[PDB]
């Protein structure tokens, strides 16, 4: 049923990664989730699903096939450095601070009024 191809593998020793375009064949399934693709990609490359980052799965019309992109790092430490913070947030690794960007500009423009150590008391 569900298979994986990786038709455009690349070593890419510059970022300690493994670039490839993942093709998933799912005739009856519905756009196989990342958790099933990562664990199926870990046994394909003899690695752990904790260092596999897949994204960009776009299912073709009619169904049965979808194509994406995958990243396999040498270690989890090299992943936390080279992988964007938003894909680490898709895992239990990175936690983005709820800062409410609209409110960040408010505190900044208020600190632009007072001068000195009193800026810390503003916000």
């Amino acid at each position: 049923t569900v298979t994986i191809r990786t038709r455009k593998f690349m070593t890419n020793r510059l970022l300690q990664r493994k670039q490839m375009v993942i093709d998933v064949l799912h005739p009856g399934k519905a756009t196989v989730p990342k958790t099933e693709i990562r664990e199926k990609l870990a046994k394909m490359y003899k690695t752990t699903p904790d260092v596999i980052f897949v994204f960009g799965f776009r299912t073709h019309f009619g169904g049965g096939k979808t194509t994406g992109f995958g990243m396999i790092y040498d270690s989890l430490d090299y992943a936390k450095k080279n992988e964007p913070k938003h894909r680490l947030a898709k895992h239990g690794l990175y936690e983005k601070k709820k800062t409410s960007r609209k409110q960040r500009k408010e505190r900044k423009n208020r600190m632009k009024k007072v001068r000195g150590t009193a800026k810390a008391n503003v916000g």
């Binding site: 005739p27 009856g28 073709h60 019309f61 009619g62 169904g63 049965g64």
Partner: protein
């Protein structure tokens, strides 16, 4: 338009799909159509569970 016709393992839904020579011998029913090798439609499945 009802997603039954496919062209060489691609469900084509456009009637104005201009078929070329190498794609003419590969026109067949989709692998999920009740006419092809697929589960029958909702009408057949609903009329079956009644009786």
């Amino acid at each position: 338009r009802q997603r039954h016709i496919r062209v060489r393992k691609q469900v084509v839904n456009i009637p104005s799909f201009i078929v070329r020579l190498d794609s003419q011998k590969h026109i067949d029913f989709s692998l999920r159509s009740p006419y092809g090798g697929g589960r029958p439609g909702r009408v057949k499945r609903k009329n079956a569970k009644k009786g």
